[PDB]
Design a protein around this motif. Structure first.
Motif, PDB file in Angstrom:
ATOM      1  N   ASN A   1      -2.592   3.534   2.307  1.00 16.37           N
ATOM      2  CA  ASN A   1      -1.470   2.646   2.069  1.00 16.37           C
ATOM      3  C   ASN A   1      -1.979   1.222   1.839  1.00 16.37           C
ATOM      4  O   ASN A   1      -2.949   0.772   2.475  1.00 16.37           O
TER       5      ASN A   1
ATOM      6  N   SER B   1       7.810  -0.633  -9.679  1.00  9.54           N
ATOM      7  CA  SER B   1       7.060  -1.535  -8.826  1.00  9.54           C
ATOM      8  C   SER B   1       6.065  -2.380  -9.607  1.00  9.54           C
ATOM      9  O   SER B   1       5.551  -1.937 -10.630  1.00  9.54           O
TER      10      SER B   1
ATOM     11  N   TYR C   1      -2.914  -9.304   3.072  1.00  9.98           N
ATOM     12  CA  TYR C   1      -2.743  -7.926   2.694  1.00  9.98           C
ATOM     13  C   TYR C   1      -3.824  -7.116   3.393  1.00  9.98           C
ATOM     14  O   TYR C   1      -4.860  -7.663   3.782  1.00  9.98           O
TER      15      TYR C   1
ATOM     16  N   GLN D   1       4.314  -7.575  11.122  1.00 11.73           N
ATOM     17  CA  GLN D   1       4.920  -6.345  10.627  1.00 11.73           C
ATOM     18  C   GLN D   1       4.456  -6.038   9.207  1.00 11.73           C
ATOM     19  O   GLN D   1       4.664  -6.836   8.294  1.00 11.73           O
ATOM     20  N   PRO D   2       3.815  -4.880   9.020  1.00 15.02           N
ATOM     21  CA  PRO D   2       3.313  -4.472   7.704  1.00 15.02           C
ATOM     22  C   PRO D   2       4.424  -4.000   6.774  1.00 15.02           C
ATOM     23  O   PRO D   2       5.333  -3.289   7.204  1.00 15.02           O
ATOM     24  N   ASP D   3       4.347  -4.396   5.509  1.00 10.05           N
ATOM     25  CA  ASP D   3       5.263  -3.893   4.498  1.00 10.05           C
ATOM     26  C   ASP D   3       4.454  -3.070   3.501  1.00 10.05           C
ATOM     27  O   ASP D   3       3.531  -3.576   2.862  1.00 10.05           O
ATOM     28  N   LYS D   4       4.790  -1.792   3.375  1.00 15.69           N
ATOM     29  CA  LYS D   4       4.043  -0.910   2.489  1.00 15.69           C
ATOM     30  C   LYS D   4       4.412  -1.192   1.042  1.00 15.69           C
ATOM     31  O   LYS D   4       5.582  -1.172   0.679  1.00 15.69           O
ATOM     32  N   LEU D   5       3.407  -1.475   0.227  1.00 14.85           N
ATOM     33  CA  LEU D   5       3.606  -1.807  -1.181  1.00 14.85           C
ATOM     34  C   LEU D   5       3.452  -0.624  -2.115  1.00 14.85           C
ATOM     35  O   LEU D   5       4.160  -0.510  -3.109  1.00 14.85           O
TER      36      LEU D   5
ATOM     37  N   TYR E   1      -0.677  -2.600   2.286  1.00 16.17           N
ATOM     38  CA  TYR E   1       0.344  -3.362   2.986  1.00 16.17           C
ATOM     39  C   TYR E   1       0.243  -4.847   2.708  1.00 16.17           C
ATOM     40  O   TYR E   1      -0.855  -5.411   2.581  1.00 16.17           O
ATOM     41  N   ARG E   2       1.399  -5.499   2.666  1.00 14.37           N
ATOM     42  CA  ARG E   2       1.464  -6.941   2.812  1.00 14.37           C
ATOM     43  C   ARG E   2       1.807  -7.213   4.263  1.00 14.37           C
ATOM     44  O   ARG E   2       2.728  -6.607   4.808  1.00 14.37           O
ATOM     45  N   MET E   3       1.058  -8.120   4.883  1.00 14.58           N
ATOM     46  CA  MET E   3       1.132  -8.397   6.318  1.00 14.58           C
ATOM     47  C   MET E   3       1.855  -9.712   6.581  1.00 14.58           C
ATOM     48  O   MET E   3       1.888 -10.586   5.720  1.00 14.58           O
TER      49      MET E   3
ATOM     50  N   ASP F   1       3.869 -14.258  -3.959  1.00 12.79           N
ATOM     51  CA  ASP F   1       2.954 -13.169  -3.592  1.00 12.79           C
ATOM     52  C   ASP F   1       1.808 -13.673  -2.709  1.00 12.79           C
ATOM     53  O   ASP F   1       1.054 -12.877  -2.151  1.00 12.79           O
TER      54      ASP F   1
END
Ligand SMILES: [Cl-]
Ligand SMILES: [Cl-]
Length: 112
Positions: free
Chosen positions: A35, A58, A86, A40-44, A37-39, A82
């Motif tokens: 996976n 996406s 990450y 709580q992690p957000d899955k991209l 993630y952009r960092m 952005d």
């Protein structure tokens, strides 16, 4: 399982450019998911492409390079927003379910 590595530690691009990090991961013979993630992690985005849910449009892509060990984690048309940190995370699906994270990398998107 070993953690993946994520490079370069600092990536600076101009808004509108693409930006690509490389995640390197040495697998065992067992199934895994990688996976971004952009960092709580957000899955991209993920490798393999997720087939448990419908496809999603996406700006973010994960691609396995032909050597199998390296993966490109790319953003198209990077925006100022952005900018951030990450990481990539490897999830072993067997024999035990575990996640191991890379260190973070920073994306800095500068003004045109
Ligand atoms: Cl790392
Ligand atoms: Cl795939």
């Amino acid at each position: 399982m070993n953690p993946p590595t994520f490079s370069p530690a600092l990536l600076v691009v101009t808004e509108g450019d693409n930006a690509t990090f490389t995640c390197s991961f040495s697998n065992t013979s067992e199934s895994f998911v990688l996976n971004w993630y952009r960092m709580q992690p957000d899955k991209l985005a993920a490798f393999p492409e997720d087939r448990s849910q419908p496809g999603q449009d996406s700006r973010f892509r994960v691609t396995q390079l032909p050597n199998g060990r390296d993966f490109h984690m790319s953003v198209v048309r990077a925006r100022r927003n952005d900018s951030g940190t990450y990481l990539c995370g490897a999830i072993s699906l067997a024999p035990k379910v575990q996640i191991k994270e890379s260190l973070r990398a920073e994306l800095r998107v500068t003004e045109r």
